[PDB]
Write a protein that binds this ligand. Structure first.
Ligand code: NAD
Ligand code: NAD
Ligand code: NAD
Ligand code: NAD
Ligand code: TCL
Ligand code: TCL
Ligand code: TCL
Ligand code: TCL
Lengths: 256, 256, 256, 256
């Protein structure tokens, strides 16, 4: 509860209280971290500011950052650098795909939808790392969130599965790049969690019940389980760990 | 010598006599197949045509097909359908990334370069499969070519490594989609081979020397070794094999 | 039907007409190979000789070979050397574990049952390779059979899953050893097939139904599909392929 | 710091203060854990008793446990049960192979050397878990240590690589078994560290220099980096993590 004392992290991707990013924010806060939040656009600004305010302590900086927009991304981290001076990591909790691509067969994925999913769900990690690198003057960790669907075929995940494969490969190439600067890059592969974006995946309740039935720990995962693993990865306990993908999924990933 | 007797395959991605696609074409021809060739633009028409000419026992069908162009892709396979009625598979031997992206550090990859590499090197397999599906009425195999860099970090591969991870995930999701229609989808992961596109990968002679020194078979791969593995995957011998990635790389992939 | 003309292979592990080894033998024969058969003990001798006699041509050499017995393993391959002088490959189709260890929880596996499974199902590949190397003076391929349960957790497989992990790792270390001598080592990972040994695995009809319902090709594998992939791996077509594990499982391995 | 307050762990495999198990013991101690130690035989008893003394005083429970000896192993955990009643985890840091089997080509591995390596380095995890299960009534975590050589071919590791493949598969099958009882099972894959047993692996200085040059973090790993990841896996922070293999190896595992 003082593992992250004296450290500041940027948390990207809070949309509401069910967001995995908000679970991460709570765990980081509870471990003593100061937090900077970024939100996608005006629609979500008050949700994020209100949640940030429920944390006790100094008021958290809350900034707009649409990761499809290089100008805004650059400006966002320039502001951060000037206002706080040093950060020790970034939690990248961002993905998007068109729902029409998610519903159809994968072979019917639109070109524009494929590239949009790649842009937001995979390339944005690299765009973010490029700007974050400048502010992580003492090193630290960059974290992203992935899903089993990026490693193997899971139903109704389709275009997002292929985007997560890009993301997981990006984690490795970024780790190899940034390690010499003392920056680690890792992923958490979370099991299914009911979030705002989970509605894009078909019959989510069958999926949850399947986890309960078959996963080794016989229960579904929580935002807090993901956040507590994020606490480890952002801490000095994980200083030897980079380019890794830790499954926080009740062991489901081992099943064949 | 007769494994592919009576079957016709579309080979995409011949550019010159060193192209892996040309090794695949020659092997398929040696196993009794008839071949159709597509070429990327006007600058390649004559060369692809000259090579296609040297296949005895058949006349040439050689068509323009820019896989970024949906109207042309659709028209190309409609022409194929009208000319031969049924094909039994497609060899997708196509990739591209900007030189400046391949030379820099991965973290400095441009957004447009990333999406361009994804479009041409990964999404195009899906775009091709969607059209090929219409002409593969007796089932068959769709093959693509990948590289170890899509699985693990290899030097000077960067944005292409991430595009190959995307391509390999696509192979799996497409296999899952098309299998019910009797269409298999597989990759060959080739070891380094001196081709036109190898010029964009830096220090290639030393990469080859590394294979020679360290690979289990103590030698570099050839276009013909890849071609002969394609013969298998396109044949009835591989009718139980789909969603697979066969390394044709002198064993190098097993090394830690 | 001439891929393997002029070549001689030792097929180990035929027990009856449903044995995967017998699928492999029929495919290799149809491809022009001469064959040598080994059998586990006196109880199987009749079956194996009867099956071998159904092959057109000169009656195949048939020899006892308990792979737990180093004296007999050595004598067997010395007899092979005196009878045919040179062989071009070996199909290792051998496994065993106590049926109590397959039933109970894996954590209740007995020490002697664990070591017995390792001895027969994993180490025997290496013991066989060491003798085969003496007779494979022109190079060739050594093949073994594995199962998805060596990679991920499959129900009831337990101690055999751990032995297959050991087997798959042995394939890689042997490939690295023997490649410099022109010897390739590969595995086929077969999907579930009703054989004599499949009686040891619980609810087998249920397993086959799941494959039929969920596998990309919507059907279960056959001994012939495995045999035809073995033809590839034993042929010159696969001369660039070593340390590989080819799944012949209707694509099931890709599912998450 | 208080992550493990009020919890007791069994540390197996301390030989001297360079032992990875000793790095683990120190980290657990610093996180507030109470520790029980086991030693292999009388040759190492003094080392282990004295090191245990520095952390726990002369109170400490220090017990003989040759993991090849089922009587002694059972007696060990029976003593733990009636001395402390409940434990919350076990660190299994035990491996052995004959030095001859580590130098010769893998194909020359002796049968009894192979089974010996499997017995001590892989089956012991299962035999330990079967006893630990009885005293882990509040749940917890079982940890083992593995090496990249269990996944891919690393030079001069041979029979131990195959034993680590078995160990890693055992982690998965054990996790699937014990999860329903609230017990997690995980591995740490450590990078090369100069320990007592590292002498078994040839030209170790060369291996270390390789890591320093090429690993993403450009430095070799330490016992403390491993211990601190162990603290995470034994803590409530990792309650969603089971059947996982975390590489603590400066990122080296991502490289191809
Ligand atoms: N929910 C699950 O079961 C699950 C499982 C595994 C991984 N994940 C991953 O976790 C991450 C967070 O998703 P979630 O489930 O918490 O849902 P969510 O809807 O709460 O979070 C998605 C976030 O992405 C943001 N985003 C989308 N487009 C953006 C853009 N252009 N610029 C900036 N931000 C943008 C949204 O504003 C939102 O905050 C995603 O990467 C998701 O794929 C989720
Ligand atoms: N050369 C190697 O060492 C190696 C190793 C592994 C994989 N590969 C892969 O093999 C495949 C073939 O590459 P190669 O080495 O034979 O090189 P190459 O340059 O001969 O072939 C690449 C082909 O892609 C085509 N292409 C590019 N953009 C296209 C577009 N818009 N539409 C249609 N075609 C387009 C080019 O015209 C060319 O024919 C690629 O996927 C490559 O990544 C190559
Ligand atoms: N049947 C399947 O669905 C399936 C799937 C994947 C892999 N496999 C593997 O295929 C291989 C062949 O099994 P199968 O299904 O054909 O069954 P099977 O019972 O027909 O063959 C197993 C063979 O192993 C032999 N064997 C056992 N102990 C031996 C010893 N001490 N010395 C020599 N030979 C010995 C038996 O005599 C028999 O010939 C095994 O490795 C098995 O694990 C089977
Ligand atoms: N040193 C490294 O670079 C490295 C890297 C990755 C993994 N590992 C693994 O870490 C673990 C600890 O090894 P280490 O490097 O600390 O060396 P070490 O020599 O300090 O520890 C190995 C321990 O195994 C014990 N052991 C051997 N046979 C035993 C038996 N019959 N019963 C009980 N205990 C027995 C020894 O007594 C010793 O305490 C091993 O599993 C090793 O394979 C080591
Ligand atoms: O990756 C996810 C995986 C699961 Cl099981 C549930 C939700 C996920 O998150 C998303 C899914 C689809 C879209 Cl459009 C956007 C996001 Cl954030
Ligand atoms: O994938 C490849 C791998 C290697 Cl080792 C060599 C060449 C390869 O092929 C390409 C590399 C870069 C670009 Cl721009 C396009 C292609 Cl086709
Ligand atoms: O590996 C196998 C996998 C499957 Cl699905 C079915 C049978 C298999 O083969 C065996 C299973 C158990 C034992 Cl005792 C011995 C063998 Cl040969
Ligand atoms: O697994 C290891 C990996 C490395 Cl790089 C170094 C030492 C290791 O540990 C061992 C190696 C050989 C033997 Cl005989 C026993 C053990 Cl404990």
């Amino acid at each position: 509860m003082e593992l992250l004392q004296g450290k500041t992290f940027v948390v990207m991707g809070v949309a509401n209280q069910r967001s995995i990013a908000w679970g991460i924010a709570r765990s980081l806060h509870n471990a003593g971290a100061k937090l900077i939040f970024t939100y996608a656009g005006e629609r979500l600004e008050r949700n994020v500011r209100e949640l940030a305010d429920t944390l006790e302590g100094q008021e958290s900086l809350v900034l707009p950052c649409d990761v499809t927009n290089d100008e805004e991304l650059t400006a966002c981290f320039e502001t951060i650098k000037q206002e706080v001076g040093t950060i020790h990591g970034v939690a990248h909790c961002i993905a998007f795909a068109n729902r029409d691509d998610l519903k159809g067969e994968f072979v019917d994925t639109s070109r524009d939808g494929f590239l949009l999913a790649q842009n937001i769900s995979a390339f944005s990690l690299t765009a973010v790392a490029r700007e974050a690198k400048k502010v992580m003057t003492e090193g630290g960790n960059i974290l992203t969130l992935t899903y089993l669907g990026g490693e193997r075929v899971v139903k109704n995940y389709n275009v997002m599965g292929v985007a997560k494969a890009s993301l997981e490969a990006s984690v490795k190439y970024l780790a190899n790049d940034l390690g010499q600067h003392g920056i680690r890059v890792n992923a958490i592969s979370a099991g299914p969690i009911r979030t705002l974006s989970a509605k894009g995946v078909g019959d989510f309740n069958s999926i949850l019940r399947e986890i309960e039935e078959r996963a080794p720990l016989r229960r579904t995962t929580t935002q807090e389980e993901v956040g507590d693993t994020a606490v480890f990865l952002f801490s000095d306990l994980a200083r030897g760990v980079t380019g890794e993908n830790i499954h926080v999924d009740s062991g489901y990933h081992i099943l064949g």
